[PDB]
RNA sequence: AGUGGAGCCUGCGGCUUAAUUUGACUCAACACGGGAAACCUCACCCGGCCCGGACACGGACAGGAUUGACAGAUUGAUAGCUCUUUCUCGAUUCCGUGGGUGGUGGUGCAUGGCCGUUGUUGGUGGAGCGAUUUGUCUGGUUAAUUCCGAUAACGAAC
């Protein structure tokens, strides 16, 4: 009716969004009920990134955290993975709409980062720039860790070490659940006969740096197997020695 | 859940995982003729 | 004097102590040698286009551009060039060069002056303290 | 290779706009006779979802919602 | 038939400009960048808001850190990215101090991933210590080491 022309003429502005203030009915789409039929309405594959990154905006600002996973899932991740498989970097407004959206913190996890790592097809480039943005957020302990036992227990990409690594350099208390979950996967890189990058090397070097502290003799001299089985010309030696001057407790 | 456990010192937090794997008009109106009125005050051509 | 002749040189330290600081003899009187002060200007040159870039930070107004236009540019990797046109009221410039610039690159000029001595002249020497070590 | 000066140049950006910070801006919500009756001085908020907790910007004509934006008059 | 002489238009130099954005200079420089640019299409100019990393240290924050915002007043812009109204949002923190500490960096070097099939000069022979030569040539023919034929050369690949 009246309402689906008011939203086509809402689409035609935000299809040549670049700043200036936005029609109020656009500011108004979490509050509705039918949420679903008047975005498909607006067409979010034909906006601009300024108009996405005020619609992230919107939507991370007004609670109810599942809505806010689904736009995440739905909208902001494919247009991130499209932006970067053919402009080879991400652009200024979506990478403030990705900050925005680390704002909320539980939708993002579970819909920007876990569903990335679990398609499979995450580029390295992919995982740098969505590393870098978890690096500037400051994140809550409970999600790192929720985060960090997921991508501990998934199935091994060359990207999720970069995830782990940069995860690992938050410096955060860390829960022994998921200490537990990294020590396995490590172990569970023992008998692998693939040739592993410096990337998982370096992951395994930061999680000997900031948490020796904390390793129990058994998985210690089980880390000392693992670099004996999987040696590097270079960095080996220094997680040796890391492991060698450790003090429990 | 692995067998390699912490064994001694200490817990502080329990921790919250059964979140993260377990997940998976008036006014309207109103503010159409906003956008209505809006979108007329673009072009106003007749106040003097 | 005339040559050949011992030349030391002493620095007042502190507490009335001669420190040596340098040595060695006296070359020919003249006040006709010139001694040229060297200032080194460098600017940024970053729009690159073949053989001609766009260069800033050397100068920022238009007519400082016009006034040092005559003097000839050289580059820390061995090329040079000169000034072309300035295009905005900041110190913008176009300059050309005999090749092409790197993006790495940076443009400089050199300028000289003749400077002279200073008249300190004052033949009463403090006497020293007899000389240690820290 | 030919590394750079890098030129300084001092400009003062510490100067910077934030806004006014109000303390305990809770006092004013309600106002408590000595016997212990609480009276509510700004107006309850009737809409969908945010009924009870939220009060009204109280305007020099109006009152206005925190949080769904209800205008009155 | 003209062009070069004339008026207009377009291109390149030059001259102006704050800017008159830009590679190419006798074919392959010259209506090439689908380039017939009033906003974008613009690479140029004159102004004006905004913020610009992690880590370490020192502050504030639960006696809200911070987020979101209707109406009105401003500057060249309907700037909640400032004021009156301060109402909500529950840590998702922002304020200084720094540091070859830098990372959505730039560039070079080394090596590898995605797809299948199994006119020039070599090989062997002859000449010379060798550079080299013969093949690749008397004649006729051909656009041509092509063809006929002669022949210390015979067979070939692109
Ligand atoms: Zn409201």
Known sequence: ?249 | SSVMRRNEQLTLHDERFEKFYEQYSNRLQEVLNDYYKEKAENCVKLNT | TFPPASVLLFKQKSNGMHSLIATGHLMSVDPDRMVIKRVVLSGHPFKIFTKMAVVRYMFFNREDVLWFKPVELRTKWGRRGHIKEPLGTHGHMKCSFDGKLKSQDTVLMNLYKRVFPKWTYDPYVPEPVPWLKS | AKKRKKKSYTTPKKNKHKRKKVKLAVLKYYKVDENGKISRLRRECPSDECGAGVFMASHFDRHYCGKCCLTYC
Not at chain 1, 185 to 193: A, C, S
Request: proline share 6%; with cysteine.
């Open chain 1, 1 to 249: 009716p009246r309402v689906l022309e008011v939203y086509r003429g809402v689409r035609e502005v935000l299809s040549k969004y670049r700043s200036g203030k936005l029609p109020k009915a656009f500011k108004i789409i979490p509050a509705l009920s039918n949420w679903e039929q008047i975005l498909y309405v607006t067409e979010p594959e034909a906006w601009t990134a300024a108009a996405m990154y005020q619609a992230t905006r919107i939507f991370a600002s007004n609670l109810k955290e599942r809505m806010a996973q689904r736009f995440y899932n739905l909208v902001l991740l494919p247009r991130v993975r499209d932006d970067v498989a053919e402009y080879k970097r991400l652009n200024f407004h979506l990478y403030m709409a990705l900050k925005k959206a680390l704002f909320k913190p539980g939708a993002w996890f579970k819909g920007i980062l876990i569903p990335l790592c679990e398609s499979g097809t995450c580029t390295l480039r992919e995982a740098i720039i969505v590393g870098s943005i978890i690096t500037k957020c400051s994140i809550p302990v409970l999600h790192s860790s929720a985060a960090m036992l997921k991508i501990a227990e998934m199935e091994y990409s060359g990207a999720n070490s970069i995830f782990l690594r940069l995860l690992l350099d938050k410096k955060y208390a860390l829960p022994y659940r998921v200490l537990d979950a990294l020590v396995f996967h490590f172990l569970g890189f023992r008998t692998e006969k693939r040739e592993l990058p410096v990337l998982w090397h370096q992951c395994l070097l930061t999680l000997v740096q900031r948490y020796k502290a904390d390793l129990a003799t058994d998985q210690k001299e089980a880390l000392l197997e693992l670099l004996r089985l999987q040696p590097h010309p270079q960095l080996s030696p220094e997680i040796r020695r890391e492991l060698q001057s450790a003090v429990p407790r």
